[PDB]
Design a protein around this ligand. Structure first.
Ligand SMILES: CCCCCCCCCCCCCCCCCC(=O)OC[C@H](COP(=O)([O-])OCC(O)COP(=O)([O-])OC[C@@H](COC(=O)CCCCCCCCCCCCCCCCC)OC(=O)CCCCCCCCCCCCCCCCC)OC(=O)CCCCCCCCCCCCCCCCC
Ligand SMILES: COC1=C(OC)C(=O)C(C/C=C(/C)CC/C=C(/C)CC/C=C(/C)CC/C=C(\C)CC/C=C(\C)CC/C=C(\C)CC/C=C(/C)CC/C=C(/C)CC/C=C(/C)CCC=C(C)C)=C(C)C1=O
Ligand SMILES: CCCCCCCC/C=C\CCCCCCCC(=O)OC[C@H](COP(=O)(O)OCCN)OC(=O)CCCCCCC/C=C\CCCCCCCC
Ligand SMILES: CCCCCCCC/C=C\CCCCCCCC(=O)OC[C@H](COP(=O)(O)OCCN)OC(=O)CCCCCCC/C=C\CCCCCCCC
Ligand SMILES: CCCCCCCC/C=C\CCCCCCCC(=O)O[C@H](COC(=O)CCCCCCC/C=C/CCCCCCCC)COP(=O)(O)OCCN
Lengths: 71, 318
């Protein structure tokens, strides 16, 4: 005496189902990354130049200590 | 008292290696939306012990067609070299202080390939022979570029002594001066340790098991131990070479903690790379190393020779 009951889609329909590709760009420009790399290299070069000059001075100092002790 | 130091070096490395396998299984699992070993002990902490005990209580077999002497010799050479290559590493002090530690490490690396070669040849199987020939091709691919990268980087250090690398990077990491070479160096390490995407000597999906297809139980476990030890060792060498920890002569444990953390980060990066990429074809690896890595490496070697003279920044200790 009841209505016919069956597995049916809801009245109206279903919400949209996405199927198309989604691969967003999400990236910097090439110039930006190249510039960051070059700037990092230059900063490292300057730091290493200072440190190596100081190291050469220290080496000279301890070499002179050896020279003083040699006789 | 020196033997105590040798043991305190080698035993923790093996323990570390055993646990490394557990970490990789878990890291790979969580990157693959699963868990990895979490049943054998709390969080799978007993899994490496169970694996070792299973492997060393299983029957080893000698193939009927195999050459017994070389078959037995190869895993011993592999594991002994993997243990030996840790002795010059400054952490911050080395067990063996060498004037030329980098060259010693290069020579021992070159000798390590013969374990793979002789195991593949003495197995007297076709897949093992294919794996051994792939190892030959891999060495031919990476060796020269790796050596020239090392030379170019060490031009800023002033010598081949590993401990001097601590003094060179006192204020800044060497990567900030040589980040291009570093990338190439990283790739070379991936090719040096036969790790994905350059896991060609084994090549499970192509050669079943490659050079070690005929090995079972303890010798196979020794090959595995040697390979993972080499992975950890090369990542430690990279951390010392490019990410210089500050060293306090009165508090060396600070350097030890910094160095260990950097090494663990690099090893986890290796596991991540294995989880992320497909496998190269072993001719494409040679083409990559000889047509892309070698020209840039030669140009950068030229530049790094010219740079200290240009800027008057030549390091001491001729
Ligand atoms: C002075 C005289 C020279 C002394 C040689 C030293 C000892 C090696 C000879 C013993 C092995 C022979 C055993 C055998 O035939 O069957 C095994 C035996 C019998 O089985 P089988 O199936 O009935 O016999 C099969 C056939 O008979 C034959 O089976 P096969 O197909 O295996 O025959 C080949 C085998 C047969 O042996 C022979 O042909 C005659 C032996 C003369 C070999 C000497 C040639 C010179 C090589 C270079 C110099 C090496 C050092 C020598 C100097 C001594 C001072 C240290 O020859 C070898 O492969 C031995 C090579 C030894 C070199 C190992 C060095 C590793 C190099 C790693 C790089 C190093 C870095 C730079 C340094 O089975 C077993 O007992 C189980 C495995 C035993 C092998 C254990 C490891 C082998 C020896 C290690 C070398 C010691 C290094 C220290
Ligand atoms: C995609 O599938 C796969 C995986 O993913 C699930 C893997 O993990 C994987 C790697 C293999 C794993 C299963 C790890 C296997 C574990 C080893 C073979 C055991 C080695 C551990 C011991 C032999 C080291 C020794 C243990 C000691 C306690 C160290 C101390 C030494 C004493 C003297 C003290 C492979 C090949 C694989 O194919
Ligand atoms: C415990 C009693 C020890 C007996 C030793 C006998 C050695 C031997 O040859 O026997 C073969 C034996 C097993 O054969 P089965 O008898 O069928 O199995 C046992 C069940 N009955 O095989 C082995 O175990 C071989 C063990 C290798 C011996 C170790 C010496 C190897 C030397 C390697 C030198 C090369 C090193 C290269 C690297 C160095 C470079 C810096
Ligand atoms: C095998 C590989 C052999 C080469 C091992 C390299 C060892 C090394 O480089 O240590 C160097 C070290 C110190 O040198 P420097 O760094 O310049 O410092 C000195 C100033 N304080 O030199 C040494 O200790 C010399 C000791 C002798 C060298 C060892 C020789 C061993 C050669 C292998 C023989 C194997 C045994 C024979 C059996 C053959 C195989 C069956
Ligand atoms: C003012 C003067 C300054 C001096 C100049 C400085 C500027 C330098 C500019 C160039 C720098 C480039 C450095 C990179 C060197 C190699 C790059 C390269 O081009 O290689 C690729 C390939 O390189 C790769 O793809 C590598 C494959 C292996 C991947 C394994 C994992 C990737 C690693 C991920 C993280 C990397 C982290 C490295 C550093 C870690 C810290 C040590 C070429 O291959 P193909 O694209 O197939 O083309 C060939 C035919 N034309």
């Amino acid at each position: 005496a009841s209505k016919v009951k069956q597995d049916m889609p809801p009245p109206g329909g279903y919400g949209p189902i996405d199927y198309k590709r989604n691969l967003p760009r999400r990236g910097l420009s090439g110039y930006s990354m190249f510039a960051v790399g070059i700037g990092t290299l230059l900063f490292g070069y300057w730091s290493m130049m200072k440190w190596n000059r100081e190291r050469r001075r220290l080496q000279i100092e301890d070499f002179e200590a050896r020279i003083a002790l040699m006789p | 008292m020196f033997m105590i130091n040798i043991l305190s070096l080698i035993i923790p490395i093996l323990l570390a290696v055993a646990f490394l396998t557990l970490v990789e299984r878990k890291v790979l699992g969580y990157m693959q939306l699963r868990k990895g070993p979490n049943v054998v002990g709390p969080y799978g902490l007993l899994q490496p012990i169970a694996d070792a005990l299973k492997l060393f209580t299983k029957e080893p077999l000698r193939p009927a067609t195999s050459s017994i002497s070389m078959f037995i010799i190869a895993p011993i050479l592999a594991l002994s070299l993997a243990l030996t290559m840790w002795v010059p590493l400054p952490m911050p002090y080395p067990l063996i202080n060498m004037n030329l530690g980098v060259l010693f490490m290069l020579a021992m690396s070159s000798l390590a390939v013969y374990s793979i070669l002789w195991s593949g040849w003495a197995s007297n199987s076709k897949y093992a022979l294919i794996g051994a020939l792939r190892a030959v091709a891999q060495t031919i691919s990476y060796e020269v570029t790796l050596a020239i990268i090392l030379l170019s980087v060490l031009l800023m250090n002033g010598s081949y002594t590993l401990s001097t690398l601590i003094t060179t990077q006192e204020h800044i990491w060497m990567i900030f001066t040589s980040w291009p070479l570093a990338m190439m160096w990283f790739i070379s390490t991936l090719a040096e340790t036969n790790r994905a995407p350059f896991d060609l000597t084994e090549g499970e999906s192509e050669l079943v098991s490659g050079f070690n297809v005929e090995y079972a139980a303890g010798p196979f476990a020794m090959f595995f131990m040697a390979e993972y030890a080499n992975i950890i060792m090369m990542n430690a060498f990279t951390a010392i070479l490019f990410l210089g920890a500050s060293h306090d002569p009165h508090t060396p444990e600070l350097y030890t903690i910094n160095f260990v953390l950097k090494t663990l980060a690099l090893t986890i990066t290796f596991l991540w790379i294995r989880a992320s990429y497909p496998r190269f074809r072993y001719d494409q690896l040679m083409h990559l190393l000889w047509k892309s890595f070698l020209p840039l490496t030669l140009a950068l070697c030229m530049w790094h020779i010219s740079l200290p003279i240009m800027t008057a920044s030549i390091p001491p200790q001729s």
